[PDB]
């Protein structure tokens, strides 16, 4: 669900899931998660 992006502390390393299931998320929330991850 997109609500996983609502979680602030969660990041890519925190959210361990398969690549396709992660890609099911919308592009911009994935970009937000990426940007919060790498910095």
């Amino acid at each position: 669900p997109v609500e996983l992006g609502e979680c602030p502390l969660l990041k890519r390393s925190g959210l361990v899931v398969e690549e396709d299931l992660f890609s099911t998320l919308p592009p911009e929330v994935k970009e937000r998660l990426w940007r919060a991850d790498k910095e």
Partner: protein, 40 residues
């Protein structure tokens, strides 16, 4: 599309990410609707 309606606030589970569109369609929400939408 031409202009987004103001009733996206009534939609409980539709986001800008969910409603993926070209950006000139994203720029169309009323200002109070922007205030209610940036806070979801």
């Amino acid at each position: 599309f031409e202009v987004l309606p103001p009733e996206l606030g009534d939609c409980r589970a539709l986001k800008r990410a969910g409603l993926v569109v070209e950006d000139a369609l994203f720029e169309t929400l009323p200002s109070d609707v922007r205030e209610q939408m940036k806070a979801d």
